[PDB]
């Protein structure tokens, strides 16, 4: 319909915690082909984060039940079959986001900030695919995630301040990729530690608009470092 109505519907759905509605609204906004404002960008990201996050959380639970029912084959087969059903929904949602990124979001990004944001997003949704990838497809999926994160990383290093929350957020999620997907603690820790120290050395470049997001991500970066050591 009309874009302003769709955005207002999306904001209502968010308050109601109806994230399927919220994602449907923001996907329609995106498909109209015009570059998203920062507010629209955030709404789209929040909606799909919640939609895919529901399945990722169910997947972790069912996958853990599957492991705990080793030696009880009837129950374990049922947990495996339910996990594979959740995985199909998970892939469908990720394919949805990734297609929006390819056709509309990344080609339209006219600022380094938007470029980094959407490349990070591409890295994220390929990473969620990698979490549940198995066969010949996994290495290519992993490589797509790495290339997206790498492109964002280079742009952000050249164009954004160390304290910028999108630069910090990218370092956070890229380090998680290195640890959880590439199985490389040292590259995860090196990335998270460097992002933290560069930011902590430049605190007076924090703006009132963003210091809460930035200092939060810094804490998360050091949390991951602590855990990984």
């Amino acid at each position: 319909m009309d874009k302003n109505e769709l955005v207002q519907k999306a904001k209502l759905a968010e308050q109601a915690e109806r994230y399927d509605d919220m994602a449907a609204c923001m996907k329609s906004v995106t498909e109209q082909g015009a570059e998203l404002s920062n507010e629209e960008r955030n709404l789209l990201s929040v909606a799909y984060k919640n939609v895919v996050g529901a399945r990722r959380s169910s997947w972790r639970v069912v996958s853990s039940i599957e492991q705990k029912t080793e030696g009880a084959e009837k129950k374990q087969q049922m947990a495996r079959e339910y996990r594979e059903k959740i995985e199909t929904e998970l892939r469908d949602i990720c394919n949805d986001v990734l297609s929006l990124l390819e056709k509309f979001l990344i080609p339209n990004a006219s600022q380094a900030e938007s470029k980094v944001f959407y490349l990070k997003m591409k890295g994220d949704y390929y990473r969620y695919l990698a979490e549940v990838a198995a066969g010949d497809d996994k290495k290519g999926i992993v490589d797509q995630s790495q290339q997206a994160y790498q492109e964002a990383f280079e742009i952000s290093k050249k164009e954004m301040q160390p304290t910028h929350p999108i630069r910090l957020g990218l370092a956070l999620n890229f380090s998680v990729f290195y640890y959880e997907i590439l199985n490389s603690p040292e590259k995860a820790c090196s990335l998270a530690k460097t992002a933290f120290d560069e930011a902590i050395a430049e605190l007076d470049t924090l703006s009132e608009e963003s210091y809460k997001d930035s200092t939060l991500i810094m804490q998360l970066l050091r949390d991951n470092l602590t855990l990984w050591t």
Partner: peptide, 4 residues
């Protein structure tokens, strides 16, 4: 481990 934390992601954004």
């Amino acid at each position: 481990g934390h992601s954004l």
